[PDB]
Chain A
Amino acid sequence: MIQRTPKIQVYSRHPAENGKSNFLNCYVSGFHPSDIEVDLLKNGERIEKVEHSDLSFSKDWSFYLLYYTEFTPTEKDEYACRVNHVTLSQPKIVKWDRDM
């Protein structure tokens, strides 16, 4: 079996503005098998209200998913994404950065 490790991108739907309502996205792609654990973090704690896209794949057969939640960015709150896959020995945390 050929396992593929996921590529991860953490970003916002629209350019981030402090105090303005937005969407926090986590795009996971290039992975195999389909089973994946994706959490969006707010200062380290798991956000409960998190939705995701319907499972699809690229021409190379690797899967891609979009995880998203409503968020209001501030200058001090730390946002991130925690991703766990069978290819990962430890969960991978990618910190959200406006620009990046």
Chain B
Amino acid sequence: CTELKLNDY
């Protein structure tokens, strides 16, 4: 299972 969200750079 993958991460729910990705953070902006």
- Answer whether A and B touch in the complex at a CB cut-off of 8 Å: no
Q: A residues engaging B (CB < 8 A)?
A: none
Q: Chain B: residues with CB nearer than 8 A to chain A?
A: none
